[PDB]
Nucleic acid binder design. Structure first.
Lengths: 172, 292, 159, 208, 33
RNA sequence: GGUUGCGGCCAUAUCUAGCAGAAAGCACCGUUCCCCGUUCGAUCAACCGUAGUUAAGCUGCUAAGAGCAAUACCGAGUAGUGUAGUGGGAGACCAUACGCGAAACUAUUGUGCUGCAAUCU
RNA sequence: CCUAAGGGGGACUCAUGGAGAACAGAAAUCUCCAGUAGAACAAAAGGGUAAAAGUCCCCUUGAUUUUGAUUUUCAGUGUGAA
RNA sequence: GAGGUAAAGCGAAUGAUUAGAAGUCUUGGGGUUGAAAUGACCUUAACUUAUUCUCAAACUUUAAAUAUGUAAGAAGUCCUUG
């Protein structure tokens, strides 16, 4: 057996993670969280700085960034909405060796939401985690194990799947 | 640019965990706390209620630990339930209750504590512990071992807990993990627990789904449809089974279509065998020669 | 300044064995100790409760008390010109049955079995152990084994 | 500054190296341990000559430096700088202490110098060269012996260069394709591990 | 709106600069000059 | 003999790269009314066993595999050491006598065994 | 020095490296992979610890009461500590 | 039973340490390419890989000799049952 054309080897999105690393805390971070909750429909979570850097103007445990994880159809919809801004053209140096890819928009109004002067514009970070069926093996509590080499997601498979499913171009 | 990590020194100094910890199956912290017995109760064993859930089965075993390995006292599986009248949903919360009741009754039959320590014969969902009878042997004490499975209020392991407790076993527990426990108002709503014991949640899903999404109802509750089992007669399936479980809790092994020797002979055909030293030496010599 | 704390000088004695750190295998907790048992004492560094003092590490004694998680062991320690009876409370992680009991208890059974059979056969058997005696006479055959003559070898340097 | 070497000749103390416990230690006088044509291949210099210790003793880093310089100077003067590869085989890792630089109160000394602790039969200096250059290299070591205290022997090695093989086993392993160059040293064939990698690394391996 | 926060997984209790953040380890961002 | 649940010893069981896996089991797998937990039904909870798959997990086999384990006309009775002499030597140290006796190295072999219960082409 | 940095329970895995993501760069945040501990555990050093003893969360006061036995230092006295 | 000293080890962890060789610089400079492309080349220095010389009272997988704990019965063993 060991057929590469097996039903359970199908690539599909595991999760899409939206990151806005506003360098400060307060009103700007709160409005970035509002933007993320608007786009995803889910309450985002705020990340604290791991340590203090004077150059970046951050200190340890200061709430810096906000991010949210979306899975399922909503992740697909947000991903294609963001690929529209990228006009469906990623680079070969956007796909990791583990088969994940990401891009970054620069203005969040290009996605297609209403603009408010009070909110302003925030850039946004898109990352897609790819994976086949059976990843629960690496995430379950009991009998947790690792995924076999053939079942792993890599750069070439993800690039080809992205080109096929979106008719987009990966600029090598 | 970076150092290769998996060196021979990395493997030489690696201390592999316990075999059953590397399999991710035994929590040895919890196992030590469960198994270890008071040293002044010298050879008296502690009895564990091992409750494990697979994708298709509920396994309930009464176990005592020894140096050569654990020893099963009795065991009740969920696939025994069709004998008692429960054929579908062999992993319900109610199937968990039935398996717990079955293992409790079977253990008490093995010990001889049947007429004494009958249990809760009229299941109303009230929290209760098996109290000892004065001037008589104490109830069989058993401790729940849920393994790696998380403790949540409403989990199915505590269904086996409640069934075994109602079956006459003394199993120490609290009612704050049962379905129907109000955490804000720290009392148990026994009505909802009784609902869960007799498949009430499943019956309500059948009734609620049938009038809203009939197509999904046809796929999810197929077996009930071809069995002509509606919601209103779901409860009796459990209610009778309990009675049946109490009528004859003895273990009847499945009659085996083949003998042990036939099974072994059949299985041995599909088992690759290790190459002899000479075989792999010849392979190495051939690979050397074909390298010229 | 001298330091004479409780665990001074136990850097290597109380260390775990190489590639043997971590959880205790549970046969340690399944063993049964009765009053009168002979037990070896070996401190386990990973359990700090009920730990013996470094003097008792490597000593063997008699169980006199059995508690929930511990045994009391009697040790005789030299203090000057006599022995003093010491009573040490040890958790069972630092305790192991002495293997000298199981060998002697088997010789008792074997002596009893040999004695009863000799009475059945109406003969005698000697049960006292004997030290190794000088070997008897013997004849060495040289068929295929004619003596080979050796000589001391000359001096050489091998570097 | 320096006491006479007789004050530190014998291994009376335990080894006292640089560590997190003594930190203000000076540097050894010897810094170079390989001289001559140290990049020569194994086949170029078959003859090995050792200066061997007949003493359980301490040699200062100053003596190591002086003997190294003496041997190097003589051999390069007589036969050329590229006719040999000289290697000093002892590194001074033991710290000597000096007290004066009251009385016996608080007499723990300060680091004063470095010495190598050598045993009987321990090789001090090794010189790989050609056979025709024997008498020169020997005379290079015989002079260096004057810079050392105690007794040293000049021993002509049975082995090929700095290899652990005799001059006959090396030739056998060489004509059998079991030896490859590694710069100044060689790698030997192994009958363990990946067969394909072993065969690739030693193409001329006449397997038996 | 709710405000959950990302939890701490690391053990570095010290409030200092992190490992491998040295100057001159970076390339020339203005190499095109 | 396979498989599961619970284990004992805790790598001969681990690691890397390949290949195969009948039956059952296990597994991935499907869904969100209900108990429950999340930024996210991903993990955790519950429901169905129904729609699918051996792709992965798991199991076994392969490799002059890494590691590990064991053995030894391997090294070596070497290194070290208890005891002895009005032994040698200026000394450093060394030899001898009666005893004990390594580690590395080298070579070869192996690569989980097993207890209770249940189950299976 | 510490009302937790004591006690119980639960969940998680650390240092670091690699490959990726707007501003963002050697260092901000996000993701995956590797990761026997190369981290952390108040404070010296040593030992100990990985579904924890580490990190985070929930509940708490056993850091309570009574008076004996024992270990260390030891005279087998006291004190401290256990 | 216990031990971690002698010895041994360092192509075993930690720490110290000599020399080349082969690779990568894409996250080092100098020079030489370019009318500019960071996209090559010569070089040294970095790392990486397999090697190489030498070490440790406060290093260590291993590990003696001597010394050291216990046992070798009648207060024991077995059988039955208070």
């Amino acid at each position: 057996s060991d057929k590469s054309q097996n039903v359970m080897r199908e690539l599909r999105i595991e999760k899409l993670v939206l990151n806005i690393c506003v360098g400060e805390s307060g009103d700007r971070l709160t409005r970035a969280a509002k933007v993320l909750e608007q786009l995803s429909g889910q309450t985002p979570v705020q990340s604290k700085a791991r340590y203090t850097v004077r150059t970046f103007g951050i200190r340890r445990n200061e709430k810096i960034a906000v991010h949210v994880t979306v899975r399922g159809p909503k992740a697909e919809e947000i991903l294609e909405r963001g690929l529209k801004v990228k006009e469906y053209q990623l680079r070969s140096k956007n796909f990791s060796a583990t088969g994940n890819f990401g891009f970054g928009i620069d203005e969040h109004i290009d996605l297609g939401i209403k603009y408010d002067p009070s909110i302003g514009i925030y850039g946004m970070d898109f990352y897609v985690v790819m994976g086949r069926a059976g990843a629960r093996v690496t995430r379950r509590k009991r009998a947790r194990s690792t995924i076999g080499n053939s079942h792993k997601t890599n750069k070439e498979d993800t690039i080809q799947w992205f080109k096929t499913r979106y008719d987009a171009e990966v600029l090598d | 640019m970076q150092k290769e990590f998996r060196t021979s020194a990395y493997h030489s100094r690696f201390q592999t965990p316990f075999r059953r910890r590397q399999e991710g199956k035994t929590d040895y912290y919890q196992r030590k706390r469960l198994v270890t017995q008071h040293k002044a109760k010298y050879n008296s064993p502690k009895y564990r209620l091992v409750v494990r859930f697979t994708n298709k089965d509920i396994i309930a075993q009464i176990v005592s630990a020894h140096i050569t390995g654990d020893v099963v006292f009795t065991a009740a599986y969920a696939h025994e339930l069709p004998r008692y009248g429960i054929k579908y949903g062999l992993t319900n919360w109610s199937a968990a209750y039935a398996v717990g009741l079955l293992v409790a009754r079977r253990a008490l039959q093995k010990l001889g504590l049947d007429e004494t320590y009958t249990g809760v014969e009229e299941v109303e969902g009230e929290f209760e512990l098996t109290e000892a009878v004065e001037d008589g042997p104490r109830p069989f004490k058993v401790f729940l071992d849920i393994g790696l499975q998380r403790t949540t209020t409403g989990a199915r392991v505590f269904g086996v807990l409640k069934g075994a407790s109602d079956g006459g076993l003394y199993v120490p527990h609290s009612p704050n993990r049962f379905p129907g426990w109000d955490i804000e108002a720290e009392e148990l709503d026994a009505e909802l627990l009784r609902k869960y014991i007799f498949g009430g949640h499943v019956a309500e899903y059948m009734e609620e789904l049938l009038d809203d999404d009939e197509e999904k109802y046809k796929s999810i509750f197929k077996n009930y449809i071809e069995e002509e089992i509606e919601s209103e007669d779901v409860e009796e399936i459990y209610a009778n089974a309990h009675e049946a479980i109490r009528a004859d809790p003895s273990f009847k092994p499945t009659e085996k279509k083949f003998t042990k020797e036939q099974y072994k002979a059949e299985s041995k055909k599909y088992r690759q065998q290790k190459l002899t030293r000479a075989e792999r030496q010849a392979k190495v010599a051939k690979k050397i020669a074909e390298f010229k | 300044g001298k330091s004479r704390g409780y665990r001074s000088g136990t850097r290597y004695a109380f260390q775990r064995d190489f590639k043997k750190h971590g959880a205790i295998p549970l046969s340690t907790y399944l063993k049964v100790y009765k009053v009168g048992d002979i037990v070896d004492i070996k401190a386990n560094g990973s359990i700090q409760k009920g730990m013996p003092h470094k003097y008792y590490h490597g000593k063997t004694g008699i169980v006199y008390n059995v508690t929930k998680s511990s045994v009391g062991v009697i040790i005789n320690k030299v203090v000057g010109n006599r022995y003093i009876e010491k009573r040490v409370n040890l958790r069972v992680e630092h305790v192991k049955h002495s293997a000298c009991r199981q060998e002697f208890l088997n010789r008792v059974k074997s002596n009893a079995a040999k004695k009863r059979e000799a009475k059945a056969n109406g003969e005698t058997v000697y049960l006292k152990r004997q030290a190794a005696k000088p070997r008897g006479s013997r004849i060495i055959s040289t068929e295929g084994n004619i003596p080979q003559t050796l000589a001391p070898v000359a001096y050489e340097t091998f570097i | 500054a320096r006491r006479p070497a007789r004050c530190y000749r014998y291994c009376k103390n335990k080894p006292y190296p640089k560590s997190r416990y003594n930190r203000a230690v000076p540097d050894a006088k010897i810094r170079i341990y390989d001289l001559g044509r140290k990049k020569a291949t194994v086949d170029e210099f078959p003859l090995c000559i050792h200066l061997v210790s007949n003493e359980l003793e301490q040699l200062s880093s100053e003596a190591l430096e002086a003997a190294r310089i003496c041997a190097n100077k003589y051999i390069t003067k007589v036969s050329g700088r590229d006719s040999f590869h000289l290697r000093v085989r002892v590194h001074p890792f033991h710290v000597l202490r000096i007290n004066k630089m009251q009385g016996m109160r608080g007499a723990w000394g300060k680091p004063h110098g470095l010495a190598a602790r050598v045993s009987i039969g321990q090789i001090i200096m090794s010189a790989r060269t050609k056979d025709s250059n024997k008498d020169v290299v020997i005379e290079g070591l015989r002079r260096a012996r004057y810079k050392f205290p105690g007794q040293q022997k000049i021993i002509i090695s049975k082995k090929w260069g700095f290899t652990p093989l005799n001059r006959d086993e090396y030739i056998a392993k060489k004509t059998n394709g079991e030896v490859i160059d590694d710069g100044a040293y060689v790698k030997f064939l192994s009958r363990k591990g990946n067969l394909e990698a072993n065969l690739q690394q030693f193409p001329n391996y006449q397997y038996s | 709106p709710s405000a959950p926060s990302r939890e701490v997984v690391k053990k570095n209790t010290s409030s200092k600069k992190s490992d491998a953040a040295p100057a001159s380890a970076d390339p020339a961002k203005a190499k095109k000059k």
